Amino acid sequence: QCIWWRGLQNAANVNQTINNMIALNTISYGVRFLKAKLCIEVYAVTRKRLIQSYYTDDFEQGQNLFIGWADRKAESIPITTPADLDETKLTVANTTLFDANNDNITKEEVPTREKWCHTWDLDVLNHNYLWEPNNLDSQWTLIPGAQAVQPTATPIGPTYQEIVIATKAIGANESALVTTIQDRRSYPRLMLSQPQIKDETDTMKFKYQIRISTELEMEHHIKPDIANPWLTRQTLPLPALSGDGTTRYVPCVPYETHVSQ
Amino acid sequence: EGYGKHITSMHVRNIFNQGNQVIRNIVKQQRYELLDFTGTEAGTTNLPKIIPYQCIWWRGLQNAANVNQTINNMIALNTISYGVRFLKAKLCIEVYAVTRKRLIQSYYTDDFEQGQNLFIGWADRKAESIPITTPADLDETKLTVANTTLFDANNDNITKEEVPTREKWCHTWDLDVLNHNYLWEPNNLDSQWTLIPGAQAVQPTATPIGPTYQEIVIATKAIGANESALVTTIQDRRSYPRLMLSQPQIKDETDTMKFKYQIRISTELEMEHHIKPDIANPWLTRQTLPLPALSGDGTTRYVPCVPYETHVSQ
Amino acid sequence: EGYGKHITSMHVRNIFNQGNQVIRNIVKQQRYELLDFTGTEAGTTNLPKIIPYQCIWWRGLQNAANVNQTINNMIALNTISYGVRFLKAKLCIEVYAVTRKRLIQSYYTDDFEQGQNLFIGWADRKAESIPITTPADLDETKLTVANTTLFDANNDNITKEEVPTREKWCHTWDLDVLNHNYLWEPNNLDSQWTLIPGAQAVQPTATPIGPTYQEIVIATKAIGANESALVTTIQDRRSYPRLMLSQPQIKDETDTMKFKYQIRISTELEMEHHIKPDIANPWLTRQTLPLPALSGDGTTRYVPCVPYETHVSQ
Amino acid sequence: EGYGKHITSMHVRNIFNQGNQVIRNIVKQQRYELLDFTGTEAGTTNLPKIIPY
């Protein structure tokens, strides 16, 4: 849901694609995201076995990595620092993919050398609108698409509603009225989990060695050959959650119901 | 290797609704009523009655006695639904009698005017309104406006249907106005100032009706102090002019010639409830819009009842 | 003569349901559970577990935590329904792991026995039962009978499916048993001694189960001191043998070789609620039958779980 | 065995360009200019101008 697609969790993961993006953002008045391809590869499934005391790790090839979509629930992602965006350490307390009572998660199940791929359509915009470029350098900026849910603590703004209304300073003299219709998106919380397996002592502990590949297709619409500051008129602020809040909750709505006319 | 019956390598399975569930209930309200133009007080007068279909009177909230399982069904289905869309509202007036009060001496007798009709005006072509104070006021028998008629000796501005007794007057509305996969957030229809879906962009300053009456909707929802939803739609405009029941204005020796109609008024309001998903999702409010309604401290509040909507050829 | 639009001489019209309305809700309960044969106490032992599908555990009443809108939907739909018919009950066990407790020295470690299976016995061919005391007891993880196994060294009387981990075990029942336009009178499924539709004609004297377990039903309903209903049906017989989950009995040096299974158990109980008609009709109880259940003061009560039903060729 | 959606045994995958990317920009320069052979100084003279392409 966040702009972590840049890999902003760590600077070490920068690459020319970011640098390309950064530059192409300087020279582009607006950008539209096309398709975001996420692929997790599991290179191992490892269990920590207890002996005595200390633990050894043994290969559980034959178990799987769980990818939950956390659909069917209204849940969120706290985001404080870009580090927090790390999908390895990013967590919520008292949280699981497994409820002994109502198991509310649609959980894919991944063997090691089986690969888990997903793709999103960020083409949400229309009426010839774009998104105004940023370097994707913030963790509170979010992917295109409308989760109309926003906290009062951190007003996310009009970009999360189908009917967008916003203004742009773009100089004290002029102001732009950006108004669109963007189809609604859900973007439920996507979790990686181990199985909950009860050992003699406690929950049965695993560690997964995966490779996580991202491709975020970005069509930069380049600044015209002549200065036109008013192309902001067609761009919309990157969808983002504002406010002084140190920790800020990404909506991650489960889904969108549909009505038959 | 597993040899058991009806066993297969699991696919991706979670069985929960994801909001895809929908229920169609029809709240229907059927009344044999006294429509009386004879009396001198309390909406019994020559004043043409008003059927406040613009309002949520379709529940029959004018009186509690008219509650039925359709309401109770609706109420429950509202508790368990995150949103509802109104489909078609079928109003049918049946006239079982047309009665005149004749004067003799003094006291009056009533004689059958079979051969006269009940007038149903649409009060199109005029900008007029319905005052709504209490749900009682919603009663289409007593609901009136002063100095009001279906008959102007100068410009007769009303398109008035004319109903024989056992002839029936039916109408149907399309409340499907919403789109972009938006709904209306449920209420029990227990207020008289809530109004039918559709956009009469007219609203008084005294009682701001809000964004649900404009084609382009913009509103927010608290739904907790932490999150807020931006509900933005395009809903086609609706007119919903004032629908009156009237007697003919016929000048007797004394005064206007007084009638009383014994009718049955049948309502069917098709409501597709979109059920709360099998898992808690408070953010489905995101797709719902507040019931269109007129707010404010005002005791009496005026329902717009716009005549019509002009059309432009491109 | 009446010239209005959509007007016609009235036919015979009353719009009320007359009971013709029906709603299909699916109560579905999905659990990732610890199925443990290792422990020495409280249903953790070698004793084969029991899935009490004969009981109304399909609600997940074993624990309140497993409530979901399907129950809440059911509950409400029961308030507004005069009767309900169960359609198909889909049980699916998914095995996410097969785990053995290995002994070293002393303490145990758990190792993956992928390559062994979970046993699902039907406990057919035997007359056996399920003791039910509390809804907790309905938990298929802890639900057991003493001196009980899927493995007899002498006559092995159980038809036992065998499930690899990511192989899934699904079953489906037909609860459509009723006919002659009878239904079951709704309950919230909040009791553990209520049982699934279908006739196991066996009932204990200690806890008379009643006429709903015989093909030919005869019962009365108070439904007020003034009137009483005679509910008489023909419902085909059902067997519903005891369904156990077990580990293999494998003799280690010490004792039986202990496993624990991490499974997910998914339930879908299709329920067609027949909604209360749009007008009060307390006598629709006439067509409903009491939920099949075992009565009596008994704290612990034995669910029949008959093995099967023989068939005769005419 | 893996049952998830859009899952397949990995092929050889590294996604990096390997230089295969190319961009076509057109630098274009458009001028309404004074070309003057009249003046007596500083390239304004009868001398034929040169376009240093």
Numbering used by the authors:
A (entry chain A): 102 to 153, 158 to 366
B (entry chain A), C (entry chain A): 49 to 153, 158 to 366
D (entry chain A): 49 to 101
What did the study's authors say about this model?
We report the discovery of a parvovirus with a bipartite genome, Acheta domesticus segmented densovirus (AdSDV), isolated from house crickets (Acheta domesticus), in which it is pathogenic. Our structural and molecular examinations revealed that the AdSDV packages one genome segment per particle. The AdSDV capsid displayed an overall “smooth” capsid surface with the only protruding area surrounding the fivefold symmetry axis. The AdSDV VP subunit displayed the canonical eight-stranded jelly roll fold, complemented by an N-terminal βA, located on an elongated N-terminal region.
The subsequent sucrose gradient had two distinct particle bands; in the 20% fraction (empty capsids, EC), and in the 25% fraction (genome containing “full” capsids, FC). Cryoelectron microscopy (cryo-EM) micrographs revealed that the consistently high genome count of the FC population (in the range of >1015 genome particles of each segment) is indeed due to the presence of almost exclusively full, genome-packaging particles. This number was multiple logs lower in case of the EC capsids, which displayed an overwhelmingly large proportion of empty capsids. The interior of the FC was filled with density attributed to the ssDNA genome. The slight amount of genome-like density of EC capsid interior confirmed the genome quantification and EM results, namely that this population is heterogenous and is composed of EC1, EC2 and FC capsids (detailed by Fig. S7). The EC, EC1, EC2 and the ORF1-VLPs monomer lacked two N-terminally ordered residues as well as the unusually elongated C-terminal tail of the FC population, making Gln366 the last ordered residue. The AdSDV fivefold channel displayed two distinct conformation states i.e., either an “empty” for the EC fractions and the vpORF1-VLPs, or “filled” as observed in the FC population. In contrast, both EC populations displayed DE loops pointing inwards, narrowing the pore from 16.0 Å (FC) to 10.1 Å, with Tyr159 and Ile152 retracted underneath the DE loop peak.
